[PDB]
Design a protein around this ligand. Structure first.
Ligand SMILES: *[C@@H]1O[C@H](CO)[C@@H](O)[C@H](O)[C@H]1NC(C)=O
Ligand SMILES: [Ca+2]
Ligand SMILES: [Ca+2]
Lengths: 83, 196, 82
């Protein structure tokens, strides 16, 4: 709680969970980042930018690649199609 | 060849350039028309966005964000707002004449807005299959205006516009059971004649 | 009472998931709720409701103290009967 209460005030903190020996729970494939963008580049997405100027939000997300597809992180090579 | 014209006739309908009325009730933000389509530079990205508009009512105010020449001029609640002015201001123009907001953006682009819901973007002969979006490709062929973002023709428009939403994690709209009577006129055959 | 799927967008309330955690946005009405995996409610709310909203999360004023004003309107010292 103390992490977020300082983040909301205009001063964010970084990497505090590295040594704290407690990470908040999240489903498989993802773990807790800090200040990830809400507009997560997912798989079935349209490559448009500079509309998501929203503020930065904490929460768990995928690795550097490994795009999202239906609540799991999957590698960008295996992006499906839909019909 | 003449100058084509999209439209948004009412809350949830769309008339393509080549001429194809279809039904698409959505509540997310959708690409009405753009130019960054396949193998092109990508000059302009007119968008459209509705809120509480799956069922037409006194709700459903529209929001429109048009992105041309590195700009961001947008409009809702009657007035037009510039969030980021664009470089070549020479082509910009705004003609608040009458009930409409006519709005030029270049040699071959124009927008019209009745201050309430309608969006009638007008394009010139310049493009001729350089665009895509909910208004289609502007090629004359009238039965390929359902080419989704994943490059195939679909038959059901409610699966089409779901391909063109910006936020890929908002709610995709629901395949409604087809019928000649909408919700209020459903099993209210009296009222269905006073409206007809 | 009818269980719906998710996402969901009726009546101007987009019920999404962000960063693996569930969100309920009401920007037309001025609030953003969410829950995490463990279960930790959060309510981001417009400055608008200053000298205004009153509930279990207190009035959006400045005074951290006075923000136990009961449903009658009574500054109570106890954080519990409030
Ligand atoms: C709050 O509203 C009350 C009643 O109108 C007024 O007396 C008071 O000055 C207001 N205080 C602030 C901080 O605006
Ligand atoms: Ca066409
Ligand atoms: Ca307070």
């Amino acid at each position: 709680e103390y992490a977020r209460t300082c983040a909301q005030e205009g001063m964010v903190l970084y990497g505090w969970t590295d040594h704290s020996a407690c990470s908040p729970v999240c489903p498989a494939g993802m773990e807790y980042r800090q200040c990830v963008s809400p507009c997560a580049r997912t798989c079935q997405s349209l490559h448009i930018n500079e509309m998501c100027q929203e503020r930065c939000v904490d929460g768990c997300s995928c690795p550097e690649g490994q795009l999202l597809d239906e609540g799991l992180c999957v590698e960008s090579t295996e992006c499906p199609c839909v019909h | 060849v003449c100058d084509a014209t999209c439209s948004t006739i009412g809350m949830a309908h769309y008339l393509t350039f080549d001429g194809l009325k279809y039904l698409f009730p959505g509540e997310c933000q959708y690409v009405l028309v753009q130019d960054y389509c396949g193998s092109n530079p990508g000059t302009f990205r007119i968008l459209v966005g509705n809120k509480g508009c799956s069922h037409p009512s006194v709700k459903c105010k529209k929001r429109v964000t048009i992105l041309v020449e590195g700009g961001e001029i947008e409009l809702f609640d009657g007035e037009v707002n510039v969030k980021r002015p664009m470089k070549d201001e020479t082509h910009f123009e705004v003609v608040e004449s009458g009930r409409y907001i006519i709005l030029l953006l270049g040699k071959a682009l124009s927008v019209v807005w009745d201050r309430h819901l309608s969006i009638s973007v007008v394009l010139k002969q310049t493009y001729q299959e350089k665009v895509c979006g909910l208004c289609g490709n502007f090629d004359g062929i009238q039965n390929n205006d359902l080419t989704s973002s994943n490059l195939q023709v679909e038959e059901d428009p409610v699966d089409f516009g779901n391909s063109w939403k910006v936020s890929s994690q908002c709610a995709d709209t629901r395949k409604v059971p087809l019928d000649s009577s909408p919700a209020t006129c459903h099993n209210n055959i009296m009222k269905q004649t006073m409206v007809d | 009472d009818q269980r719906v799927s998710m996402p969901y967008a009726s009546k101007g309330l987009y019920l999404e998931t962000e960063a693996g955690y569930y969100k309920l946005s009401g920007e037309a009405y001025g609030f953003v709720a969410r829950i995490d995996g463990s279960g930790n409610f959060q309510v981001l709310l417009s400055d608008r409701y200053f000298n205004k909203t009153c509930g279990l999360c207190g009035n959006f004023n400045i005074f951290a103290e006075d923000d136990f004003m009961t449903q009658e309107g009574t500054l109570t010292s106890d954080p519990y009967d409030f």
